[PDB]
Amino acid sequence: SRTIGIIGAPFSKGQPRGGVEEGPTVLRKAGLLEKLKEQECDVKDYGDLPFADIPNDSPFQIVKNPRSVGKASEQLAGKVAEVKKNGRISLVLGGDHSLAIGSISGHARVHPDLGVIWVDAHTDINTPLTTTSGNLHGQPVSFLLKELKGKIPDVPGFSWVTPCISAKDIVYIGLRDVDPGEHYILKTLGIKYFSMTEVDRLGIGKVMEETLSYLLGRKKRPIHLSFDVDGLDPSFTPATGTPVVGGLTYREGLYITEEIYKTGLLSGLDIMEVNPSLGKTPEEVTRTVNTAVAITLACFGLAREGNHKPIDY
Amino acid sequence: SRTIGIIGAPFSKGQPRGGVEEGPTVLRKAGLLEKLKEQECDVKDYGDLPFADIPNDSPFQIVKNPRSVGKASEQLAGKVAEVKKNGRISLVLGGDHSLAIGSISGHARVHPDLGVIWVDAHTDINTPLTTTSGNLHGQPVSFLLKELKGKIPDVPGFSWVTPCISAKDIVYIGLRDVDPGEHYILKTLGIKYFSMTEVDRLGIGKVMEETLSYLLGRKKRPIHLSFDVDGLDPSFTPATGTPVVGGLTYREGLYITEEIYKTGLLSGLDIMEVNPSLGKTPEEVTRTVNTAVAITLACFGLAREGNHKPIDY
Amino acid sequence: SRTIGIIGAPFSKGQPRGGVEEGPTVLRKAGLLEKLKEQECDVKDYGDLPFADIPNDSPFQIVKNPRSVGKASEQLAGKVAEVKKNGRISLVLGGDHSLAIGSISGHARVHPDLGVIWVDAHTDINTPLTTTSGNLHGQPVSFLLKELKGKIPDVPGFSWVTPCISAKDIVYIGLRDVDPGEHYILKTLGIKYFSMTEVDRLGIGKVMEETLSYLLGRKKRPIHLSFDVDGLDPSFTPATGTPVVGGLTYREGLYITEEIYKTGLLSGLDIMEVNPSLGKTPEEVTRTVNTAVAITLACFGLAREGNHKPIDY
Ligand SMILES: [Mn+2]
Ligand SMILES: [Mn+2]
Ligand SMILES: [Mn+2]
Ligand SMILES: [Mn+2]
Ligand SMILES: [Mn+2]
Ligand SMILES: [Mn+2]
Ligand SMILES: [Zn+2]
Ligand SMILES: [Zn+2]
Ligand SMILES: [Zn+2]
């Protein structure tokens, strides 16, 4: 049995639309924990991370809420590192994707050999010197990369940070809205990725075969899955901050996660950018939440083909 | 020319939502028969099967309307067996999927070597001892299997029944909502299937190549296609009793059926679970009916690439 | 750099629903030209082709508005031939697909070795003697084919015409609504095509590999892409004259065009059948226009994976 540890993170200072704050909330009332237990899972919810307010948090150049983002992540990392040390998989129900910084950081403290699968319509690899918005939920990857150890200036609240992954340890799946500076970083650091073009060309089947062998070619190792809800198409996950048409299918979302589970190597999972306050209708919110939950359960065993426990039925 | 024989079956006692009753009706007024004739088809409609009411039909353990379901099927089988003996393909326009019991039963009486392709989001293989709802439209396959000759008790109205197919003679396509007991039966009886996971992995192209070679590997034989409208995604066939998201695409539905036609071996076709009374809007009903009809015509020659009769145009 | 030349063509006499007239208009106010320039493109808009009215244009047998269609095309050809001679790619923002006659005709005058990719739900290959509607937007291909040099009578306004392509120089992608006479012409002239059946079987990835090697097997040559908006599914391009469900996906539409751009051989592009007056809602119009624009930019470099100019970021 692969055991889980819920980590609610109602943070939103990584982007403008604050609705993401109460995202861990809408997921739990959906019955996520219950459904996980409803499965062969052993679940322990560590509660929502109370991120005290940091009123005095002016901009740093163009970067917004740097101390608030850096604090919420430095805290989360400490928690992530706690559950992983308690023999469990970290399930971070988030607000915005800036939390990844702390989530992957903590996971690494325990399993430094980890590999990352980043499902997003975006690469979130902009730097304070490349960002054009200042919103830190589109810059987390730039802080975790060792290669970028030089082009990222010191941001208030990110002193505690120390790049924990190489360019050859992360795979992107779903990309379809990448900046020019971001693309440049990809080709340069030789980052592995499967944009929607490659998904259309290859099929989600081969794309998963290739990403997993890429990550587990030489050796098996803890897998961290960072799932940004906007990776999927808006017709499935409409209630999110920055939607891009031409996204991953419901089925493709499930394939992604069913295959990861079958690897038996999932140790870290992030479920970010779900914002109910942006759904134009009550059903759009429900649609988004149900999809999020569904992708979650697939990571932990729920397969569309069927489930049966070892007992003579 | 492969000739057809319409068999309307306005039955619904296989499940609670009775709207399925008047399903053969909404299909005919759509012009199905007409459109079939509008093709290279030779069509003969044997009329709707009048299933007299059986007021005194209390439950048998948990199983509901057992005598009503058993009667409607024992009758249909007698009809199916009639058209097939009259050199035609049986087209059963149904209500609920419990009718399959009689439809496949009758077809076998004529062609005992038949093979079955079961397109459904469900396996409908629960037994009276495993069913958790008691609705017989989710138990028909359990009654047709020879291997299960032992774990199915005697149900009032199903005495006439005698299992007519082995586990290696049926292929499922579309599965995405299977019970634990049902999954167990699959793995145990080694039943061939392509759930949505495999469809996503392989593609509907290879899935059809593999199911057909599986069924026709050793020898060619009469093919019975049991098509449950919920096999397709609810965005295409919304007006159905038990919808499951992440279903088969419109195109995939057509591919399935175009390939079956091209085999030249189609002898039995079921079109079930269409319930106009469940469509939330007039257009949802139309959408579902048009899709049903479309899948029907593809089984009998209508190809998206084009059609041309042997004449110098 | 591959340079572009905008050619607005507000023509509609190729079909009944005149809304297509003001199609080049809705595309420009969308910012198409701007966005093209916003890219690495060198754009020059030759303005909209003013197609004077030809009041006295009675039917020719069954063919409607023959002099109006023939005139608007003979003019466009003269323009197309002009930009191509001015070292640019022809971008024809159209109304109805009958304009292809003149668009491909002019392009050929400059590059007679050109190859055509025809993205449509239809083949538009009916002849005045086969057409059953008389609308010339469903007959343009029949006028450009050298093999059909015999079965097409003289239509008022098409004297200037001289078939400029062989059956082995055109590839169709997207077909799903073909007449019997049209299918006959395909099989007979041995025309290469990938209907939705083949797309479902092979995947848009292989379909593009096969069409490009088919067209560029022996030698590289100028590529003309005739994109009829109805080639895509109505859920993406609803505001069009003759919509057919089961069409090409948004993603597939982009794959088509991204691969064509990567060939570096695009010389001619048509964007037809966009009719805002048929969108049932303001958003349906927007959805259709944005999709059209998006397919356009992909033809000229915009890739979902990312873009970066040769400069040390
Ligand atoms: Mn994103
Ligand atoms: Mn993100
Ligand atoms: Mn079903
Ligand atoms: Mn069923
Ligand atoms: Mn068309
Ligand atoms: Mn067309
Ligand atoms: Zn952002
Ligand atoms: Zn049921
Ligand atoms: Zn037309």
| Residue among C130, C180, C245 whose CB faces B250 most closely | C245
What lies within 8 Å, CB to CB, of A283 at 6+ separation is none
Any CB–CB contact under 8 A between C132 and chain B? Answer: no
Q: Which residues pair with A268 in a beta bridge?
A: A90, A224
Q: For ligand 7, an ion, list residues with CB under 5 A.
A: A 135, 138
Q: Which of A20, A8, A93 is nearest to A279 (CA)?
A: A20
Q: Which of C245, C220, C288, C254 is nearest to C19 (CA)?
A: C288
CATH at residue A3: 3.40.800.10
Residue B230 designated active-site: yes
| Residue among A184, A196, A203 whose CB faces C313 most closely | A184
Tell me the chain C residues in contact with residue B203 when contact means C-beta distances shorter than 8 Å.
201, 203
Residue A312 designated active-site: no
Residue A200 designated active-site: no
Q: Token digits for A126? A: 């902009």
Query: Quick one: which H or E segment has residue A211?
Result: helix A204-216
SS3 assignment, position C218: coil
Tell me the chain B residues in contact with residue C193 when contact means C-beta distances shorter than 8 Å.
305
Tell me the chain A residues in contact with residue B196 when contact means C-beta distances shorter than 8 Å.
251, 254, 304
* Relative orientation angle of helices C100-110 and C66-85, to the nearest 10 degrees: 30
What does residue B155 show for φ and ψ, rounded to 5 degrees? -100, 130
What lies within 8 Å, CB to CB, of A262 at 6+ separation is none
| Residue among A205, A305, A313 whose CB faces B202 most closely | A205
* CA torsion angle C88 C89 C94 C98 (round to 10): 110
Resolution to one decimal, Å: 1.9
Give A204 Cα–ligand 2 centroid separation in angstroms. Answer: 20
The 8-class DSSP code of residue B274 comes to B
What order of strands is seen across the sheet that includes strand C115-119? C43-48, C4-8, C89-93, C266-272, C223-228, C115-119, C170-173, C192-194
E strand intervals along chain C: 4-8, 43-48, 89-93, 115-119, 170-173, 192-194, 223-228, 266-272
Distance between first and last Cα of chain B: 21
- Cβ-count burial A78-100 (b if 16+ within 10 Å, e if not): ebbbbbbeeebbbbbbbbbbbbb
Best residue in C202, C262, C313 for a mutation probing chain A (most A CBs within 10 Å):
C313
Number of domains making up chain A: 1
**A212 and A255 Cβ atoms separated by less than 8 Å:** no
Distance CA B100, CA B69 (A): 10
Chain B window 169-208: which residues touch A at a Cβ cutoff of 8 Å?
175-187, 193, 195-203
**C-beta atoms surrounding B304 within 10 Å:** 25
- Could you identify the residue written with the tokens 């939440």? A289
Chain centre distance of CA B299: 13
Which one of A74, A96, A122, A233 is the catalytic residue?
A122
Residue C96 designated active-site: no
Distance CA B236, CA B79 (A): 31
Task: Determine the residue type at B49.
Answer: L
What does residue C43 show for φ and ψ, rounded to 5 degrees? -110, 135
**A81 and A44 Cβ atoms separated by less than 8 Å:** no
**C-beta atoms surrounding C214 within 10 Å:** 16
Q: Which of B133, B180, B122, B153 is nearest to A312 (CA)?
A: B180
Experimental method: X-ray
**B99 and B272 Cβ atoms separated by less than 8 Å:** yes
Tell me the chain A residues in contact with residue B245 when contact means C-beta distances shorter than 8 Å.
250
Rounded to 5°, the CA angle A272-A273-A274 comes to 100
Distance (Å) from the alpha carbon of A183 to chain C's nearest alpha carbon: 5
Distance (Å) from the alpha carbon of B201 to chain A's nearest alpha carbon: 4
Tell me the chain C residues in contact with residue B39 when contact means C-beta distances shorter than 8 Å.
none
Give B241 Cα–ligand 8 centroid separation in angstroms. Answer: 8
**A143 and A66 Cβ atoms separated by less than 8 Å:** no
| Residue among A177, A193, A201 whose CB faces C255 most closely | A201
SS3 assignment, position C300: coil
Any CB–CB contact under 8 A between A55 and chain C? Answer: no
Query: Quick one: which H or E segment has residue A200?
Result: helix A196-202
Distance CA C286, CA C27 (A): 10
Tell me the chain B residues in contact with residue C182 when contact means C-beta distances shorter than 8 Å.
306
Give A193 Cα–ligand 1 centroid separation in angstroms. Answer: 14
* Relative orientation angle of helices A250-263 and A204-216, to the nearest 10 degrees: 30
Distance (Å) from the alpha carbon of A177 to chain C's nearest alpha carbon: 6
Give B78 Cα–ligand 6 centroid separation in angstroms. Answer: 50
Which one of C96, C120, C177, C258 is the catalytic residue?
C120
Any CB–CB contact under 8 A between B292 and chain A? Answer: no
Burial class (CB in 10 A: 0-12, 13-18, 19+), B218: exposed
Distance between first and last Cα of chain C: 21
Looking only at the bridges linking them, the beta strands covering B223-228 and B266-272 are: parallel
Q: Which domain holds residue A288?
A: 1-313
Q: Which of B73, B122, B119 is nearest to B95 (CA)?
A: B73
Chains with 3 or more CB pairs under 8 A to chain C: A, B
Any CB–CB contact under 8 A between A261 and chain B? Answer: no
**C113 and C131 Cβ atoms separated by less than 8 Å:** no
Residue of A nearest to B185 (CA): A313
**Does B120 belong to an annotated binding site?**
yes
Distance CA C162, CA B244 (A): 55
E strand intervals along C174-264: 192-194, 223-228
Distance between first and last Cα of chain A: 21
Residue B111 designated active-site: no
- Count CB pairs under 8 A between chains B and C: 63
CB spacing of B180 vs A306 below 8 angstroms: yes
**C-beta atoms surrounding C173 within 10 Å:** 25
The 8-class DSSP code of residue A153 comes to P
CB spacing of A305 vs B193 below 8 angstroms: yes
Distance CA B211, CA B215 (A): 6
Distance (Å) from the alpha carbon of C250 to chain A's nearest alpha carbon: 6
Which DSSP string corresponds to C228-239?
EGGGB-TTTS-S
Which one of A21, A74, A120, A177 is the catalytic residue?
A120
CB spacing of C203 vs B204 below 8 angstroms: no
